[PDB]
Amino acid sequence: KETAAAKFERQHMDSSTSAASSSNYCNQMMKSRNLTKDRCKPVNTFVHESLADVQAVCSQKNVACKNGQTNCYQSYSTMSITDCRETGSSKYPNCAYKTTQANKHIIVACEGNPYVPVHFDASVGPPGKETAAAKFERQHMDSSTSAASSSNYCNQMMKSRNLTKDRCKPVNTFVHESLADVQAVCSQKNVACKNGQTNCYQSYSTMSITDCRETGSSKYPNCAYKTTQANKHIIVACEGNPYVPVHFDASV
Ligand SMILES: [Cl-]
């Protein structure tokens, strides 16, 4: 019995190759993945990224699924993908496909514990624009993992969350807790923010966090960071309706 997560890998994952080289790619891949067994599946997308990279998308930009569900996620980075579209002259069982390569952001539906991709929803071309709450999640939320695995966490994460694009962002914290726990902080201990405003809140509880701080020798575009893992209360500024985090003020 194939799990939903496994069916997604079969139908949509192709890590073991960087892109759709040949124009016959789809022809071969659609066949080997059993997508032409009962019929020539009209269209399909393959993602040429590591499983972990695609799996991390489940902790990225939350967006509305095409089907009306809320469990879809758009990747912060563009990915190598291949769209396969059946040709007009394709006849089963010799299904024929036009192979199309692109670099785009992907949108997947995620499910389960662990929380992994179970459907491919769409692809989105460059670029896009961001809400305060969305930006907070990109810069400061890492729900996927329980903590840092090494001291290379920050080098990887700072880059993949686009925090080293124009310059090296010097200091930035990531919170390894659920979104609901972090959002709940907006209703916890009210405190003043560093800037003197009073829409800041300190979590009642310590949380698993990671402090990314650029090294003193680091220089753009070669941004180097030290990774420090810790358990501290966070302090966030909250705004809007719903009343959610929009700035990471400090941890204490
Ligand atoms: Cl920060």
Please enumerate, by residue number, every residue annotated as part of a binding site: 7, 10, 41-45, 66, 85, 135, 138, 169-173, 194, 213
**Distance, CA 250 to ligand 1 centroid (Å)?**
7
Residue 233 is among the residues annotated as catalytic for this protein: no
Residues 215, 218, 224, 227: what is their CA dihedral angle, to the nearest 10 degrees? 10
Contact 168, 220 (CB under 8 A): yes
Q: Where are the domains of the chain?
A: 1-126, 127-252
**Distance, CA 129 to ligand 1 centroid (Å)?**
21
Q: How is domain 127-252 classified at the architecture level of CATH?
A: Roll (3.10)
User: In angstroms, what is the resolution?
Assistant: 2.1
In the DSSP assignment, the letter for residue 165 is: S
The C-alpha atoms of residue 213 and residue 209 are separated, in whole angstroms, by 13
Which segments within the chain are labelled E, that is strand? 43-47, 61-63, 72-74, 79-86, 97-111, 116-124, 171-175, 189-191, 200-202, 207-214, 225-232, 234-239, 244-251
CATH 3.10.130.10 matches 1-126:
yes
Experimental method: X-ray
Q: By C-alpha distance, which of 147, 199, 195 is closest to 174?
A: 147
Residue 119 is among the residues annotated as catalytic for this protein: yes
Domain pair 1-126 / 127-252, same fold: yes
